[PDB]
Amino acid sequence: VTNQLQYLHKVVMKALWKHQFAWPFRQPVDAVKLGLPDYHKIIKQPMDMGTIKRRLENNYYWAASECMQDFNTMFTNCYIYNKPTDDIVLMAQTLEKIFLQKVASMPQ
Amino acid sequence: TNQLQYLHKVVMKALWKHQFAWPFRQPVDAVKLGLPDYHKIIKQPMDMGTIKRRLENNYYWAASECMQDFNTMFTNCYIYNKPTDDIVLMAQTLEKIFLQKVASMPQ
Numbered sequence: 652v653t654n655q656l657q658y659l660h661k662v663v664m665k666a667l668w669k670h671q672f673a674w675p676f677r678q679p680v681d682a683v684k685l686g687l688p689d690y691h692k693i694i695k696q697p698m699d700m701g702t703i704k705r706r707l708e709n710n711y712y713w714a715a716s717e718c719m720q721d722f723n724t725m726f727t728n729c730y731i732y733n734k735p736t737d738d739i740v741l742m743a744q745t746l747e748k749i750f751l752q753k754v755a756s757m758p759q
Numbered sequence: 760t761n762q763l764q765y766l767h768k769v770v771m772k773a774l775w776k777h778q779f780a781w782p783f784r785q786p787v788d789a790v791k792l793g794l795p796d797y798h799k800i801i802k803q804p805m806d807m808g809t810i811k812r813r814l815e816n817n818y819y820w821a822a823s824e825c826m827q828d829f830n831t832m833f834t835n836c837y838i839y840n841k842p843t844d845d846i847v848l849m850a851q852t853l854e855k856i857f858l859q860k861v862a863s864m865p866q
């Protein structure tokens with residue numbers, strides 16, 4: 652458990668997971684339930700904050716770069732898949748700015 | 760700032776010289792590039808040239824202001840372009856380097 656991963660769990664995940672915009676990212680996209688049949692045709696590496704939260708919990712990551720990449724993949728999937736006007740894009744944009752801000756003060 | 764000098768001289772140099780960085784070294788010219796819808800979809804254009812000038816003339820107050828400009832540039836690319844466009848892959852490749860370099864910023 653590196654200091655950075657610790658920071659990513661205690662500071663970054665703590666901040667993002669409890670956020671009023673977090674709820675659509677707390678679990679993988681359910682393409683059936685959300686009625687997005689082309690989702691897994693366009694997004695080939697799905698990611699979400701539940702997966703990351705669990706991986707930070709089970710010390711799945713060897714580096715912070717890895718956990719950072721997963722956050723980035725989750726936000727990037729949303730910007731790529733969704734129409735520019737979808738509310739979820741601006742929800743992801745809001746979360747991703749918190750993530751960046753926090754990451755600006757991560758150790759090492 | 761020590762962090763802004765790291766963004767200038769470690770992160771931005773790595774990104775600037777990358778073989779995929781050429782579309783991002785200067786603002787999108789919607790006219791020359793044939794994209795008249797570009798500014799109706801992208802309301803905050805951003806590019807590494809602007810970020811570079813801004814680091815040179817001391818525009819930024821904090822690292823995170825500059826990291827937010829990098830992100831806006833990448834996010835603009837994902838939002839405007841179709842998922843199949845090569846520029847999407849180019850941006851992600853550049854974005855991962857940025858995330859990797861930022862992890863090692865002086866705290």
Ligand SMILES: Cn1c(=O)c2[nH]cnc2n(C)c1=O
Binds near residue numbers: 674
């Ligand atoms: C958990 N959650 C919320 O917190 C929320 N707020 C508004 N819609 C919401 N939906 C659809 C939801 O699932």
Ligand SMILES: Cn1c(=O)c2[nH]cnc2n(C)c1=O
Binds near residue numbers: 728
């Ligand atoms: C991440 N994500 C999306 O990318 C998306 N697109 C449409 N609904 C969506 N929902 C609810 C979602 O969670």
Ligand SMILES: Cn1c(=O)c2[nH]cnc2n(C)c1=O
Binds near residue numbers: 792
């Ligand atoms: C950033 N950017 C784009 O987002 C884009 N979309 C299509 N060509 C593009 N070019 C040349 C570009 O520089």
